Amino acid sequence: SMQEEDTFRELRIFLRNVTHRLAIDKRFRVFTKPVDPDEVPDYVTVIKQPMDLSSVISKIDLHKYLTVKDYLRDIDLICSNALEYNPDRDPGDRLIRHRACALRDTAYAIIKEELDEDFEQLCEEIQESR
Ligand SMILES: CC(=O)N[C@H](C(=O)NCCCBr)C(C)C
Ligand SMILES: [Cl-]
């Protein structure tokens, strides 16, 4: 229905605003664009589902997220990809793991404070009815 289309529209506006707030934070610059295969030719070979905040915006706009839970699965991938690709004890890998964890925690904290649980439940029920 048009009411349901309005609900998904509101979801996309909410997700674009959360994603923009993560993207303008200086800590998260490394996550704003895909890993360039130049610098890192093995990346695409180790990480099977690369994810970054530009990809998340593209997905919002393609109507790929019908719930906040689906969007958080992709935020979780940004975190878990960095834990998997940069697991060593040296400071460069610890810094990216801490930043990727902080991204994830920040997205979850904004959603805890600003997503109404009844709005999420509505999205879940429309998605399940399709
Ligand atoms: C997203 C990611 O894991 N990036 C790794 C990383 O530590 N970069 C940090 C920053 C500088 Br441009 C890289 C080894 C592929
Ligand atoms: Cl830095």
Structural domain boundaries in the chain: 1-130
Radius of gyration of the chain (CA): 16
Ligand 2 geometric centre to CA of 102 (Å): 14
Residue 21 to residue 107: CA distance in whole angstroms: 9
Q: Which ligand sits nearest to residue 46's alpha carbon?
A: 1
Q: 3-state class of 121 per DSSP? A: helix
**47 Cα to the center of ligand 2, angstroms:** 22
Contacts of 60 (CB under 8 A, 6+ apart): 12, 15, 16, 19, 71
Comparing C-alpha atoms, which of 70, 60, 77, 57 is closest to residue 130? 70
DSSP-derived 3-state class of residue 35: coil
Distance separating alpha carbons of residues 24 and 37, to the nearest angstrom: 24
Ligand 1 atom 6 nearest Cα:
96
Tokens (6 digits) for 53 = 């905040």
Q: What is the DSSP letter of 50?
A: -
Residue with tokens 């801490």: 98
Atom of ligand 1 nearest to the CA of 96: 7
25: CA distance to ligand 2 center in Å?
Answer: 12
Torsion angle, alpha carbons of 32, 102, 49, 113, to 10: -90
Q: Which of 120, 116, 99, 107 is nearest to 31 (CA)?
A: 99
- The domain at 1-130 falls in which architecture? Up-down Bundle (1.20)
Q: Which residues line ligand 1 (CB under 6 A)?
A: 30, 35, 40, 43, 82, 85-86, 92, 96
| Ligand 2 centroid to residue 40 C-alpha, Å | 18
Ligand 1 atom at minimal distance to the Cα of residue 47: 3
User: How many residues in the chain?
Assistant: 130
Cβ proximity of 121 and 68 under 8 Å: no
